[PDB]
Chains A and B, each alone.
With several copies, the nearest count.
Chain A
């Protein structure tokens, strides 16, 4: 029947006081965080059955947590295993969950949520079912509905309630569509939290003080949400309201514009569940939300994203690629060589974590310009209120611009970011290796040159290692750690810990030309340029890139990588195997690169690439492009263009896994998503294979069958390797 139940250890402690205020303290003994799992559903079922059973002796309810966090997340381990035939169980689970919260919400008495810490996803949904929300303004505390980042949606009433609280437009844009996490002050200002306190010890007292005052002042409206009152007026109007109905058709198009046409069905479903829910009563609305939730969980994109942004990301942060047994070594002073975009961005993220940074260049005028990158970054942060004047002054005070190698004294962590040249890097390291501390990490920020070669320019080769950042350093989240064949496991762990300290994500890569990220993004760029030489419209190439889910279209990306540098890579990779005895099969893009260089259009730095660059900004494609490459003479299907770029990267990633470049698919997925911007809906260039979906089917077999369909039409570089064959 219609029940609050769907063996497990109880997760809720019950306490009724003299006044009649029942305090539900959630404390899952199977982990450090309260999680919406089977144990929670069963326990909240018992507790809500008890609140209804003892209704005559209960005047109010206080929901609290005994953990550092309030409540954060759900059963991803179960949600990822749900097959399309399991949609009935998934639908009935969220229906059972919401039936518990809806009973709590309609008990006829006030319920207050004591938010002592993080209230994320299902945690905020529990609090949103309460009539009053009191949050402790502690450090590390967050509130939000981040289900969309795992390809799901807030299915425990989050979508229905935030729409009833803020209206369709504000709830979707501010809360739902992006899964934004708010600090407790932002939460109070936008309405997610009602009031704040400074310590968790005041929470339950303040909650019972509010329950007592609410009953005394507002007895008839106690325990009644705004949408359960006669004459409830939804903010911004309902879809039948003529004010909202005028702009409502533009919501799917604005969403389609922001997503650039990429296949992301979670935001499409959230928007549908919000609007469809605002057209009916609350109960009918939440059941609609449950159907869209079940529709996402049983889908592949959710499984792609649950694998990457939950399981793979936790496997990485737990140290899956960190050498076993090695302990922690402190970092006292960081020495950055070079004040370019990389060196300046590196100096910022390092000093932002709290490290003392020495920023050396060839001139003081140059190093001061490098620190200016941090000053201009903190300037934007101050006027937008994301930092205080005090911490901003302290941050910049940790960056010491210099031009002498003597100021590298006391540096136990070196990050070189000078020009890409082996004998230049040998010289820069040669004159600082003796000034720095004897256990100092000697790191190079190189994109292509092998670490084993650069390491021979120092004596302590066991402490030489590649630390590959990505520009802009302040916003790109990955650090590619390259392990030369003389690099020690201690140096690996030390760089690994530093990466987490600056708030970035590490992947460990064995030494090889192109490493992982440069090698793979090369195949993405080369597929686009090959299509240009084949006579495909330049506008269609960029459309394919954006609709595939890429953050920046490939031709635009090519203009920023400098085609001159792009040509030098191919010259350096041919004599890397032709001088070695093997063979080098030239890519069709090399003829396109050489012709663009022939016409003096090497990229954006030059001032002209595939796009026109006027007044610092990018103003449309070069009109001579269509005449130069006979554009329009080849009009393949857009899905073929998309699959050519996705498969080329997915196959080069598998090549890297078979050669021992990467040692885990978790590094492959996160490294491709955060390093080079592989579309998040794929779950990574490795998850893309085991979760491919098209006309053929779903799985590894459908990928291979499709890769062979591409090999027949566009060349044998799409032929699947033996490792994927079964």
Chain B
């Protein structure tokens, strides 16, 4: 019923995994840093009208355990009534928190909510939480568990995407992310990380390789995997396929990074009361997925369901933003819906700038809010694939 509006969307720069600038920064500090930037931009905002803070975090362990959302509320000195809940829907946790915040507003029982994610994979690696599947061979044996990398190799094998095809996409992502950083597209969204003294720690996505070349990508060696068994397991399910063409390397897959993002979502009455200017509007969200062994073809039905739910078609969308977990996933999504190539990941993606699991959904969402405003266009569609065979998609309209 109630319409949900995005009033602010900011993100930290994404720090690399090996010798990264953010490895010394506690995950709680990345989120509190963004809260202190929202305070700086709206000093007179009555923080008591913030009814919840929803953070996505795929590995809620160690520095990221104990409800890090609540920790950020108390650490930043936000009102003790401002809640704080962590969620985990694997790679789409950041976008799921944004959608949940939007649905909480649409229900009317919530006025103004902070949403986003946080992930410091240099401090809390993926799999640190273990998992009800790994520590249980009976379930692992029956669900035929296959890590994300092999589903991507399998997708490229089935659809006929070659090693040069995925490296062609890896090159164009590094290029567009370089163009966007040069043009200043990220100037007001990427909030530099500073220490307790105010000294600079990171001001740019340091995983990028702007000097990437077709020749340099072709020399990389292909990628839970590197152990045994998962290839044969995947082909036991997809028994018509004979051999898996391993095309994905470190250069055409999403990088391991640290980062956090924040999106402020509220109702029109909330923004009007607090003098906030709307930037976009959550038109519709949707959830769907496909087989867990192929794992990553879930954003195709989730996109059709959110398009069907919004009453639109692909031709009505000005910008498509799909997370670059693997190059073959995007080429499949592009091949399926016949996405015009110049509407797809127009400012780069996770291959160039990184994929901070819990925070990625809210980062690429804020990427589109700024790009619709810059281009003066109406609609964008943000979607992420998920481990286990899920998918999430959202359509926003510039206000």
Where the two chains meet, the residues of A that have a C-beta atom closer than 8 Å to any C-beta of B are 84, 87-88, 91, 239-240, 242, 245-257, 260-261, 268, 271-272, 275-276, 279-280, 284, 287-288, 291-292, 294-295, 298, 537-540, 543-544, 547, 620-621, 632, 635, 638
Contacts and interface: CB of A to CB of B under 8 A. Distances in A.
A70 B26 CA distance: 38
Contacts of A621: 242
A631 to B, nearest CB: 9
B62 interface: yes
Contact of B136 (A275, A292, A540): A275
B227 interface: yes
Interface residues of B, number: 37
Given A252-B137, A272-B138, A276-B136, 4 more contacts: A253-B229, A257-B233, A271-B137, A539-B240
Contacts of A635: 240
Given A253-B230, A539-B239, A248 B134 contact: yes
Contacts of A279: 63, 123
B135 interface: yes
A280 B123 CA distance: 8
Interface stretch (B30-38, B85-93, B190-198, B305-313): B190-198
B130 interface: yes
Given A91-B197, A245-B130, A284-B24, A268 B138 contact: yes
B24 A543 contact: no
Contacts of B137: 251-252, 255, 268, 271-272, 275
B242 A257 contact: no
A211 B141 CA distance: 45
A87 B196 CA distance: 10
Contacts of B123: 279-280
B145 A539 contact: no
Interface in B231-247: 232-233, 235-236, 239-243
Nearest to A546: B236
Contacts of A254: 227-229
B128 to A, nearest CB: 8
B242 A256 contact: no
Interface string B8-44: 0000000000000001101000000000000000000
B81 interface: no
Contacts of B232: 253, 256-257, 260
A247 B134 CA distance: 10
A292 to B, nearest CB: 8
A539 B135 contact: no
B245 to A, nearest CB: 12
A91 B136 contact: no
B199 interface: yes
A543 B229 contact: no
Contacts of A247: 227
Contact of A280 (B23, B140, B233): B23
Nearest to B227: A250
Question: What DSSP secondary structure best describes chain A's contact surface?
Answer: helix
A242 B130 CA distance: 9
Given A287-B24, A620-B243, A256 B229 contact: yes
A449 B138 CA distance: 49
The 8 closest A-B pairs by CB, nearest first: A253-B229, A249-B134, A543-B239, A250-B227, A87-B197, A254-B229, A539-B242, A252-B141
A295 B196 contact: yes
A540 B240 contact: yes
A272 B138 CA distance: 6
Interface of B: 23-24, 26, 62-63, 123, 127-128, 130, 134-138, 140-141, 144-146, 195-199, 227-230, 232-233, 235-236, 239-243
Nearest to A258: B229
A621 B241 CA distance: 11
A240 B240 CA distance: 38
B130 A543 contact: no
A295 B240 contact: no
Nearest to A538: B242
A240 B62 contact: yes
Contact of B242 (A239, A249, A620): A620
B24 A250 contact: no
B240 A249 contact: no
A275 B199 CA distance: 22
Contacts of A292: 196
Given A239-B135, A268-B137, A253 B197 contact: no
Given A621-B242, A632-B240, A276 B26 contact: yes
A249 B140 contact: yes
A551 to B, nearest CB: 16
B229 A257 contact: yes
B197 A543 contact: no
28 contacts: A84-B197, A87-B197, A91-B197, A239-B62, A247-B227, A249-B227, A250-B228, A251-B137, A252-B141, A253-B146, A253-B227, A253-B229, A253-B232, A255-B229, A257-B228, A257-B229, A257-B232, A260-B232, A276-B138, A280-B123, A538-B242, A539-B235, A540-B239, A543-B235, A543-B236, A543-B239, A544-B239, A632-B240
B196 A253 contact: no
Contacts of A242: 128
A83 to B, nearest CB: 11
A611 to B, nearest CB: 10
Given A248-B135, A252-B141, A288-B24, A88 B199 contact: yes
Nearest to B143: A252
Contacts of B63: 279
